[PDB]
Design a protein around this ligand. Structure first.
Ligand SMILES: N=C(N)c1ccc(Oc2ccc(-c3cc4ccc(C(=N)N)cc4[nH]3)cc2)cc1
Ligand SMILES: [Ca+2]
Ligand SMILES: [Ca+2]
Ligand SMILES: [Ca+2]
Ligand SMILES: [Ca+2]
Ligand SMILES: [Ca+2]
Lengths: 89, 90
């Protein structure tokens, strides 16, 4: 696999590392999303320690309004983070 | 960096590697897009061997109508591919 193909597969891997921890194994509930952000984006995003900030991130991400973040919604999150990083540089 | 962080920067790296070849260093023209797909997506997508196919992929990706694929448009392409790959592994 190329570096791009590996990156694609990594997005899938990381999503499932967190979505499968609790409840719906195909979606990130708030607790899972918080853990993903604190554990996997510690060099890009400030550590989340407030429940408020959890609720806001999720509210931003939850396009279909079911209260969790599914894969499509997570992809939108990755695009936000990636675009932000790109724009920074 | 984490697995996810490495993935994020890989997307930016690969886009820069091809967008910088010709003309606007911050956008992919048709030839650059063809080269990225053929060289970096060779395990995922059928090799592009015809102009009609290149034209079509670019038209699909070119949301802002400027004839090229910029980073945000490329990110949309990555989302498409990743979603397709997700369904495959599922
Ligand atoms: N493959 C590459 N191209 C590549 C390789 C290694 C790289 O290392 C870095 C990773 C992350 C950052 C970084 C800047 C920054 C600014 C503000 C904030 C914030 N949230 N206040 C967080 C931030 N994190 C810097 C360098 C970067 C690219
Ligand atoms: Ca879950
Ligand atoms: Ca949702
Ligand atoms: Ca270019
Ligand atoms: Ca464009
Ligand atoms: Ca644009």
């Amino acid at each position: 696999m190329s570096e791009l193909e590996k990156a694609v597969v990594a997005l899938i891997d990381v999503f499932h590392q967190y979505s499968g921890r609790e409840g719906d194994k195909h979606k990130l509930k708030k607790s899972e999303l918080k853990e993903l952000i604190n554990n996997e984006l510690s060099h890009f995003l400030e550590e989340i320690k407030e429940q408020e900030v959890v609720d806001k991130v999720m509210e931003t991400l939850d396009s279909d309004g079911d209260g969790e973040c599914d894969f499509q919604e997570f992809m939108a999150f990755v695009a936000m983070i990636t675009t932000a990083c790109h724009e920074f540089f």
